[PDB]
Write a protein that binds this ligand. Structure first.
Ligand SMILES: [Ca+2]
Lengths: 279, 10
């Protein structure tokens, strides 16, 4: 299937070269898979979700996304126009307040919730968790991420926007999950993107158009943008039966576009998420 | 948190 004039990020992950504008993907589109977006929540009523999105858990007074960050990421995962896996089921877990803030204990609680909750859902093709958040290193946060991944959920996390080594950040520094770096439309590492040996892969993260609250849309940047591209791609590949939750990150790295990125520090992988679609 | 979402970028 093909989406013409698609956001540059979608086009990029379905091409071996930059500069294209069509997003090629298999019609299955992640149907049968589920993706938990652990963020500020999701405006589930947004037309772009077609009813495929719903809040399942909040750690605050409301389950409503009063920020927009979570709705933006969820849209990149599976909104009809801005998403990678256009048919996947989205579940929102509000672990961040409407200012985009959250305490480590709440974030950890959110991760354990998903590990257990996935057992109450019907996701025959597999479960993914997208975590576009992070802070300073913490062995407890890293550990919570490792548990979620271990329970059978494909965990994708943002590398961070400090233009530094992601070793000092969590859950970015947990080796067992999928740490996502950010790239721009000209195949350059995003200027704010963290790097380092712990990164597993890069995804489009600069000037990403997606859904926003109030039923709108807007373009923003960050490794938080990149992470849902990979979470969505994983759900897409799992639905296709190409990989499983335990090996998705590795499969994505093996089949990525190699050496296409510039301004990648020595010691950091030069790999860009790619769906390898062939019609 | 400890990351982002603030809305005037860098
Ligand atoms: Ca890893």
């Amino acid at each position: 299937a093909a989406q013409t004039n698609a956001p540059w990020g979608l086009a990029r992950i379905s091409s071996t070269s930059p500069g294209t504008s069509t997003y090629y993907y298999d019609e299955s589109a992640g149907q049968g898979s589920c993706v938990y977006v652990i963020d500020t929540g999701i405006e589930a009523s947004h037309p772009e979700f077609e009813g495929r999105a719903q809040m399942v858990k909040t750690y605050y007074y409301s389950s409503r996304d009063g920020n927009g960050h979570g709705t933006h990421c969820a849209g990149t995962v599976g909104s009809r126009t801005y998403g990678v896996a256009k048919k996947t089921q989205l579940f929102g877990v509000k672990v961040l307040d409407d200012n985009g803030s959250g305490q480590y204990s709440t974030i950890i609680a959110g991760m354990d919730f998903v590990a257990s909750d996935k057992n109450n859902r019907n996701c025959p093709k597999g479960v993914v968790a997208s975590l576009s958040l992070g802070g300073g290193y913490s062995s407890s946060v890293n550990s919570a991420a490792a548990r979620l991944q271990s329970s059978g959920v494909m965990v994708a996390v943002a590398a961070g926007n400090n233009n530094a080594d992601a070793r000092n950040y969590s859950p970015a520094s947990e080796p067992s999950v999928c740490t996502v770096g950010a790239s721009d439309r000209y195949d350059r590492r995003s200027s704010f993107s963290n790097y380092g040996s712990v990164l597993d892969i890069f995804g489009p993260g600069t000037d990403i158009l997606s859904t926003w609250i109030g039923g709108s849309t807007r373009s923003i940047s960050g490794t938080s943008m990149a992470t849902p591209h990979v979470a969505g791609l994983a759900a897409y590949l799992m639905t296709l039966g190409k990989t499983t939750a335990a090996s998705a990150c590795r499969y994505i790295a093996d089949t990525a576009n190699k050496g296409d990125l510039s301004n990648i520090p020595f010691g950091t992988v030069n790999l860009l998420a790619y769906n390898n679609y062939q019609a | 948190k400890g990351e982002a979402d603030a809305l005037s970028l860098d």
